[PDB]
Ligand binder design. Structure first.
Ligand SMILES: *[C@@H]1O[C@H](CO)[C@@H](O[C@@H]2O[C@H](CO)[C@@H](O[C@@H]3O[C@H](CO)[C@@H](O)[C@H](O)[C@@H]3O)[C@H](O)[C@H]2NC(C)=O)[C@H](O)[C@H]1NC(C)=O
Ligand SMILES: *[C@@H]1O[C@H](CO)[C@@H](O[C@@H]2O[C@H](CO)[C@@H](O)[C@H](O)[C@H]2NC(C)=O)[C@H](O)[C@H]1NC(C)=O
Ligand SMILES: *[C@@H]1O[C@H](CO)[C@@H](O[C@@H]2O[C@H](CO)[C@@H](O)[C@H](O)[C@@H]2O)[C@H](O)[C@H]1NC(C)=O
Ligand SMILES: *[C@@H]1O[C@H](CO)[C@@H](O)[C@H](O)[C@H]1NC(C)=O
Ligand SMILES: *[C@@H]1O[C@H](CO)[C@@H](O)[C@H](O)[C@H]1NC(C)=O
Ligand SMILES: *[C@@H]1O[C@H](CO)[C@@H](O)[C@H](O)[C@H]1NC(C)=O
Ligand SMILES: *[C@@H]1O[C@H](CO)[C@@H](O)[C@H](O)[C@H]1NC(C)=O
Ligand SMILES: *[C@@H]1O[C@H](CO)[C@@H](O)[C@H](O)[C@H]1NC(C)=O
Ligand SMILES: *[C@@H]1O[C@H](CO)[C@@H](O)[C@H](O)[C@H]1NC(C)=O
Ligand SMILES: *[C@@H]1O[C@H](CO)[C@@H](O)[C@H](O)[C@H]1NC(C)=O
Lengths: 248, 292, 108, 67, 122
């Protein structure tokens, strides 16, 4: 899709193998934010939004928090506290055609700067600065969209760069998306490191005597300590009390 | 008409078990004792079922054995141009569809799927249906997740919202992000016309009665009991006593004086005051000099 | 249409001018006055795109500026290269653009 | 600050805006500590049930909140 | 090289139709607007209308609205001007022109095609 009305997929309820991406040499920029590139396969994510657009080559630096520019303000704005990773690679031989390519267009004039993650399909003509324009482009009201016109003879800064941005928040369970890991058997009554669906901690696990409501993925005691969790494999409720410690 | 909300409309916010804990929650709850726009929706006379806004997510309830409330529709403009949602809660299954469909002048089922005229939908969902009985719902549309909460309690036929307390259990999370600003409920007699142009013809359905509120961002002090279910709540913005209850994180404020918040006068207006200088700086000279 | 004087005269190395009698009610209000130099038999080119701005490649010896209602383009130190027709144009208030009649530069 | 005679006694509450003139926001009594809104001024004098400041204390009239 | 290649000349019967085509080269076809202006062989120059290759929005003068239409072809990087009835007043050389401005609809005509001559017969 073009940079206006960028395609968004809501990736959820699957195991995500990130190892095929961050070790793949096909990508030009793999600048992640708020997460290490090599730790992506070892984490569980609440919801993963995958965006996709094609932009001009010199404009790939604008897709980053806090930047400014036409793409950054009128087409696609990342928030100031963005977490995720931005993936881009050159696509001059797939997105550009001989004599030109015109399926890719970008918004050039807008009355106001976009909110983060906003999407503006509105092709209504630009503000006049004068008497308003009924429906006709000209002299005050311009067409807000504009095609790059990608050509194979253009420089690397003008070549069509195909960009994918993965936006995803990393709270605890219920994590719909997590990386690949061999789930193993349950070890009760021992001081055991656990990774329950993204909920990570160290403690002993006891068969719980408390009754969860059928929606609660885990529980907490007073002062926000995670006292209980339900098993993602067999739906048993397990109490987590800390491993025994004390001064000697 | 209008009745008050007493204490109704609280729900489990975050799917986390707590027991014997007064947890201070901030979410789009129904503010206590607000007005709800109760409807004589039978509309044998007085053409009909109205379309209501969805300002920040709403609260819905009904009290009828006729079971005429059979679903809801949603959308930004409820037309074929923009996105929409249909929910139908027929006796077999719920069919939750995001379609950007073309809706009726006055929607109906008459089971016959009359409500949608043309469909090239994108998202669908089927699960178990929703069946003096008092149903309750809240519909939160936050950050791409459409959240429906539910509870139905055999109320004592008070012809309004009862003064009792009930916590809405979360029921369905829809992972669809569609801009929703208006909704309309769906009524269905067991047989009537399937023409999408009628308003007050075809059949006479049973007696109908439902409610609508609006959720506001409010702080709440939710009282989870021993078993882990909510039995009481305190709305921190309703009353200075309730604000004191939220400040102390306790449900019984004792004899004494208690500081509860800080009062500061917001500025009424903003003024800008510069001298009479109007001549412009010669940036036009220094940036357009013929030689440096 | 735009009223316009038909001709101007001179000799190579002199200074002459050509004027455009637009109406201040409709023509001069939205200015944007563009002058074009047209030899016979070939396409013309812009010679003052705004009311006073030359395009790239235009010699500096050509000057112009609106003056009240009328607009005028002047040629200083001309030669055999400047024997051409010259046309006035403007916005004319809405998308319906108008041109002038077209004066003819002549050198004795 | 609120004045509460106890939750299980009554739900009546009078508020006290410290160091505020009552020009900016049923009974509005201007104490020497601030705007005491909701309390009823009484010319009598008793023991100090709930202290307020500058020699004014509040109690439960029984039925009403007095200052 | 930013020269626009206009089509060849044509001769048409009176009252019949004719279409002229100007092919872009060098510059980006989408963007820069394309105005259509006519020059009678005797005198003057008149403006008809423009189409933008960016969006295909068209405007026309009043003298030609409802009797002459325009269209674009981004596949061949060319824009077409169509005349429905070749009246004897319209036997003229038709010129296509770019605009100086990037993507706004102003009127600053820089580069002009060689011009396809049109003739009304008898
Ligand atoms: C230094 O000289 C330059 C050269 O003229 C000045 O810049 C140019 O100023 C004109 C007149 O305002 C600008 O044209 C206008 O642009 C706006 C868009 O911002 C448009 O809406 C108007 O219709 C008009 O076309 C022009 O853009 C501008 N820049 C150029 C030519 O690159 C400049 O103002 C002078 N002073 C300084 C401090 O630079
Ligand atoms: C070209 O632009 C002009 C300028 O707005 C348009 O003229 C207006 O058109 C509307 C359409 O109904 C009329 O109501 C106005 O009265 C017109 N104004 C003037 C001053 O004529 C014109 O329609 C446009 N043409 C095209 C083909 O888009
Ligand atoms: C362009 O301007 C027209 C006239 O100024 C608008 O037409 C109007 O149309 C209504 C009914 O269609 C008439 O009742 C009214 O008198 C007027 O003629 C037209 O709507 C407007 N177009 C847009 C897109 O705003
Ligand atoms: C997951 O698989 C195991 C073995 O295949 C099975 O015992 C367990 O019940 C499954 N979990 C769920 C939630 O179905
Ligand atoms: C939702 O749609 C309405 C009507 O199209 C629009 O006015 C509103 O701004 C939209 N809201 C969002 C958040 O896009
Ligand atoms: C529905 O069809 C219209 C054209 O009739 C199309 O523009 C729109 O994208 C379609 N919506 C879908 C497939 O969700
Ligand atoms: C908790 O639930 C059990 C079984 O439903 C019930 O016996 C018990 O009384 C409940 N406890 C409280 C405090 O309501
Ligand atoms: C109210 O609270 C006081 C303070 O603890 C107590 O002495 C009194 O018995 C209570 N009265 C009732 C009716 O609960
Ligand atoms: C409060 O302000 C009003 C208005 O200026 C004044 O008349 C009054 O005396 C003030 N009271 C106190 C206690 O300052
Ligand atoms: C209290 O004293 C004031 C001031 O002297 C007087 O105006 C008022 O009437 C008195 N009220 C009572 C109940 O004595």
């Amino acid at each position: 899709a073009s940079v206006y009305a960028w395609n968004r997929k809501r990736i959820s309820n699957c195991v995500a193998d990130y190892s095929v991406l961050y070790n793949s040499a096909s990508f030009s920029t793999f600048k992640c934010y708020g997460v290490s590139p090599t730790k992506l396969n070892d984490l569980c994510f609440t919801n993963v939004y995958a965006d996709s657009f094609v932009i001009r080559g010199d404009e790939v630096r604008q897709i980053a928090p806090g930047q400014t520019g036409k793409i950054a303000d009128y087409n696609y704005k990342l928030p100031d506290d963005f977490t995720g990773c931005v993936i881009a690679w050159n696509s001059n031989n797939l997105d550009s055609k001989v004599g030109g390519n015109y399926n890719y267009l970008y918004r050039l004039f807008r009355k106001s700067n976009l909110k983060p993650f906003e999407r503006d399909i509105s092709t209504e003509i630009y503000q006049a600065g004068s008497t308003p324009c009924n429906g006709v482009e000209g002299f005050n009201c311009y067409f807000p969209l504009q095609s790059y016109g990608f050509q194979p003879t253009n420089g690397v800064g003008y070549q069509p760069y195909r960009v994918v941005v993965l936006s995803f928040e990393l709270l605890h369970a219920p994590a719909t998306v997590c990386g690949p890991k061999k789930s193993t058997n349950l070890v009760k009554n021992k001081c055991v490191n656990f990774n329950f669906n993204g909920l990570t901690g160290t403690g002993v696990l006891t068969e719980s005597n408390k009754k969860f409501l059928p929606f609660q993925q885990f529980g907490r005691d007073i002062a926000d300590t995670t006292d209980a969790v339900r098993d993602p494999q067999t739906l048993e409720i397990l109490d987590i009390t800390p491993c025994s410690f004390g001064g000697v | 008409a209008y009745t008050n909300s007493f204490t109704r409309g609280v729900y489990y916010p975050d799917k986390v078990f707590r027991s014997s804990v007064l947890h201070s929650t901030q979410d789009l709850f129904l503010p206590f004792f607000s007005n709800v726009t109760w409807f004589h929706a039978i509309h044998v006379s007085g053409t009909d079922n109205p379309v209501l806004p969805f300002n920040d997510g709403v609260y819905f309830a009904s009290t009828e054995k006729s079971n005429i409330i059979r679903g809801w529709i949603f959308g930004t403009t409820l037309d074929s141009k923009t996105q929409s949602l249909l929910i139908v809660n027929n006796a077999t299954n719920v069919v939750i569809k995001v379609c950007e469909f073309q809706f009726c002048n006055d929607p109906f089922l008459g089971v016959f799927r009359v409500y949608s005229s043309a469909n090239n939908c994108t998202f669908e969902y089927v699960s178990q249906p929703f069946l003096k009985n008092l149903r309750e719902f809240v519909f939160k549309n936050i950050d791409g997740y459409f959240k429906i909460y539910s509870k139905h309690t055999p109320i004592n036929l008070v012809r309004d919202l009862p003064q009792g307390f009930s916590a809405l259990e979360p029921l369905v999370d829809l992972p669809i992000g569609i801009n929703i600003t208006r909704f309309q409920t769906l009524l269905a007699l067991h047989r009537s016309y399937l023409t999408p142009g009628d308003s007050s013809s075809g059949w006479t359905a049973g007696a109908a009665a439902y409610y609508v509120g609006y959720l506001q961002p409010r702080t709440f002090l939710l009282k989870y009991n021993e078993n882990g279910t909510i039995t009481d709540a305190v709305d921190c913005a309703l009353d200075p006593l309730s604000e004191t209850k939220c400040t102390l994180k306790s449900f019984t404020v004792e004899k004494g004086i208690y500081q509860t918040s800080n009062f500061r006068v917001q500025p009424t207006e903003s003024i800008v005051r510069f001298p009479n200088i109007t001549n412009l700086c010669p940036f036009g000279e220094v940036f357009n000099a013929t030689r440096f | 249409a735009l009223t316009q004087p038909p001709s101007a005269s001179g000799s190579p190395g002199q200074s002459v001018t050509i004027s455009c009698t637009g109406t201040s009610s409709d023509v001069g209000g939205y200015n944007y006055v563009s002058w074009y130099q047209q030899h016979p038999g070939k396409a013309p080119k812009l010679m003052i795109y705004e009311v006073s701005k030359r395009p790239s490649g235009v010699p500096d010896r050509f000057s112009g500026s609106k003056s009240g209602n009328t607009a005028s383009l002047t040629v200083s130190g001309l030669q055999a290269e400047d024997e051409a027709d010259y046309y006035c144009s403007s916005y004319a208030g809405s998308n319906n653009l108008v041109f002038g009649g077209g004066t003819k530069l002549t050198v004795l | 600050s609120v004045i509460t005679p106890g939750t299980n006694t009554s739900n009546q509450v009078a508020v006290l805006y410290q160091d505020v003139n009552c020009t900016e926001v049923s009974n509005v009594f201007q104490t020497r500590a601030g705007c005491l809104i909701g309390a009823e001024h009484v010319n009598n004098s008793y023991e100090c049930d709930i202290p307020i400041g500058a020699g004014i204390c509040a109690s439960y009239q029984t039925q009403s909140i007095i200052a | 090289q930013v020269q626009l290649v206009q089509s060849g000349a044509e001769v048409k019967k009176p009252g019949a139709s004719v279409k002229v085509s100007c092919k872009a080269s060098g510059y980006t076809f989408t963007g820069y607007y394309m105005h259509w202006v006519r020059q009678a062989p005797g005198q003057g120059l008149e403006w008809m209308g423009w189409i933008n290759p960016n969006s295909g929005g068209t405007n026309y003068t009043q003298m030609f609205q409802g009797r002459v239409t325009m269209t674009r072809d981004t596949s061949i990087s060319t824009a077409y001007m169509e005349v429905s009835r070749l009246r004897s007043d319209d036997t003229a050389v038709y010129y296509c022109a770019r605009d100086r401005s990037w993507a706004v609809v102003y009127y600053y005509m820089d580069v002009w095609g060689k011009g396809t001559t049109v003739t009304v017969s008898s």
